[PDB]
Amino acid sequence: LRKLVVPEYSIHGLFCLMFLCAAEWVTLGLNIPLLFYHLWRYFHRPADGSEVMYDAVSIMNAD
Amino acid sequence: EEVIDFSKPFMSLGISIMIKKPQKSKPGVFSFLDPLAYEIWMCIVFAYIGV
């Protein structure tokens, strides 16, 4: 899962950049919120460890 | 015409626009992109990214 997360976020960022350059404002607006959510998710590490997005020790928690 | 009498016009004309003849424009920096439209260049960039 860790190896597979960066491609998703970066490819969505590519989508956002493309729609910016093409001047397609509506789609860019629809896509910015997910961009910021992914940014927050990747750069917060709510887990106290703060070394991996998914941590085997923190994983297996029901919440 | 109120004080003299004219003939039918021997030459009809009207207002027109005079400009300086377009010259060979001094080549612009980045004139090497002119053979292809900007949209082609951007599609090239993003096709490179996608490939």
Side-chain angles (χ1 to χ4, degrees), chain A residues 1-49 52-63:
Chain A
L1 299 184
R2 194 181 311 95
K3 182 175 73 175
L4 184 147
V5 73
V6 184
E8 208 180 31
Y9 297 178
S10 278
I11 289 163
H12 184 74
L14 169 66
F15 292 0
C16 286
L17 168 83
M18 293 177 70
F19 290 128
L20 168 78
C21 278
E24 281 291 323
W25 304 116
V26 172
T27 299
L28 177 58
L30 282 72
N31 269 5
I32 285 162
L34 182 44
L35 167 75
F36 264 100
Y37 169 85
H38 286 159
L39 182 71
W40 169 82
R41 179 78 152 88
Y42 185 79
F43 282 110
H44 201 121
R45 277 70 175 276
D48 54 355
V52 291
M53 183 178 278
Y54 308 102
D55 206 23
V57 306
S58 302
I59 295 295
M60 302 310 322
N61 177 354
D63 195 355

Side-chain angles (χ1 to χ4, degrees), chain B residues 17 20 36:
Chain B
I17 309 165
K20 190 182 197 324
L36 310 169

